[PDB]
Design a protein around this ligand. Sequence first.
Ligand SMILES: CC(C)C[C@H](NC(=O)[C@H](Cc1ccccc1)C[C@@H](O)[C@H](Cc1ccccc1)NC(=O)OC(C)(C)C)C(=O)N[C@@H](Cc1ccccc1)C(N)=O
Length: 282
Amino acid sequence: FDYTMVVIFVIAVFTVALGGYWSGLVELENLKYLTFSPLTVVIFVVICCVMMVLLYFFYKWLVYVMIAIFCIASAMSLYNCLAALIHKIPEVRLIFLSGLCIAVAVVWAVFRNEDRWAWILQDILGIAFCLNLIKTLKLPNFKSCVILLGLLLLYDVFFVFITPFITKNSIMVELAEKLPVVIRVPKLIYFPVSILGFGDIIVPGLLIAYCRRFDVQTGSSYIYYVSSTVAYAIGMILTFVVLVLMKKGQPALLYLVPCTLITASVVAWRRKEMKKFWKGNS
Ligand SMILES: CC(C)C[C@H](NC(=O)[C@H](Cc1ccccc1)C[C@@H](O)[C@H](Cc1ccccc1)NC(=O)OC(C)(C)C)C(=O)N[C@@H](Cc1ccccc1)C(N)=O
């Protein structure tokens, strides 16, 4: 047990409970986006696998390409999130916000080496990126949710567990000039860092976004969203316990997808609404 492990859990739940909640907020005003498809989901999974293999085998230039793309995407996402937050309280303001965001992104790009104090910048950029990507990506129905979660679960478990049995080098032991995707937090006793991927925040984030959208659509207030967030937090705690008591790295998707899927299925089945929750309205 350590204080750092608490901080990662708070970040991984605050920015998923807010990413999911915010998704339903725009849904409310619509009733007054790149929707996925099962074939599209499979294509995205295959492209993710190919991208990961290319990252591992062509690392030298792929790291710089990923840093540049992540910097631009995170600057844009931070601008969008800050503009959305400021819009509520009563353009030159947009230009100033874009300038501040690009200044933060440039500072992060030029200060990626010092791990003493670049982790704050990387955490803020990652939280903004995850929030924006959860808001903008909408799933059509629970079938896509289940297919994507299961395919990612099998893919990630394979990549982390079966790869050591063949490759002489786990692939993720090299993937975490480090990769600009993983969230880095040093030991918060005096400042050896922890790592949490963006997938743990995004994929259950997409499921919670869909749950909140369904909440808004059907009429129920907070049932599915609260249930999914509670199960996601319990999954994070269980993953942390298993990681500490196993002394090895652990694929969290393994202790996240079953919990979230089971809780969503149970909460949908208790009300006899599985068919509607699975087909997708309209
Ligand atoms: C909640 C968290 C604690 C769990 C964390 N596991 C993880 O973060 C998982 C695997 C991983 C990632 C990076 C390094 C190792 C292992 C993340 C893993 O599940 C996802 C899979 C995924 C999901 C959706 C879409 C695409 C991919 N990985 C992912 O999103 O892609 C990258 C690698 C680019 C971040 C972990 O095991 N951390 C260990 C690993 C470690 C890091 C540093 C030193 C020693 C050991 C730790 N003790 O900090």
